[PDB]
Amino acid sequence: TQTWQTVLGEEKQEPYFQEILDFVKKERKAGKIIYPPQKDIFNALKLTPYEAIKVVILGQDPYHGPNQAHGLAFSVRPGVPAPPSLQNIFKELHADLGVSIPSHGFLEKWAKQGVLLLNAALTVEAGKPQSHANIGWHRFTDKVIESLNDHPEGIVFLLWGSYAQKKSQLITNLRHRILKAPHPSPLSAARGFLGCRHFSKANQLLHEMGRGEIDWALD
């Protein structure tokens, strides 16, 4: 009975929402390349129904290279080499749970496991990082996070990096667990992402709440 349509129904009404969509449209008509494709913008919500959410992983913006982004945080399409950050995520996952390093970086299987892969901004212009970070997406994605406060079940949030960690203030429901760690990028100034073992911790927490664990395996 609780779906993205119902929990986001009111927010959807906000004029700023259509205006964001309108802006992206006119940009494409202007000949500019915007990732991901228009029909993929909300894949995170599509692949992980509201009531299926067990884990939430926050990203900032979609990849700005060709064939990369497809509506999920960190995930890349089949045939695309996993970028540095995602590669380091796999490194941690392997060391943490012993899961084999995937030959790809396609994370739909996680989304279907109940992992909400949510970026703060849902679009980006080709070859321009953060180019759509200040057009208003954050209003909407912040509300996606807030909508989880009314979730019947306990959710595990994996907040990597300062940006993602800020969003913790939006999570007021005490049933939820917040796990923090430095950003997975092997270039990030602060070491510490390696060893946080968020994937095993997440499964332990889900188990303790009788929700069922995440199968992180990819293949």
Residue 219 a catalytic site member: no
Find the DSSP H helices in 8-72: 9-13, 15-29, 43-47
Q: How far apart are CA 65 and CA 129, in angstroms?
A: 10
Cβ neighbours of 46 (radius 10 Å): 14
Q: How far apart are CA 5 and CA 214, in angstroms?
A: 25
H/E stretch holding 178: strand 177-181
Q: Are 177 and 201 in contact (CB under 8 A)?
A: no
Strands across the sheet with 156-160, in order? 115-119, 55-59, 156-160, 177-181
Catalytic residue, chosen from 61, 96, 142, 150, is 61
Catalytic (active-site) positions: 61
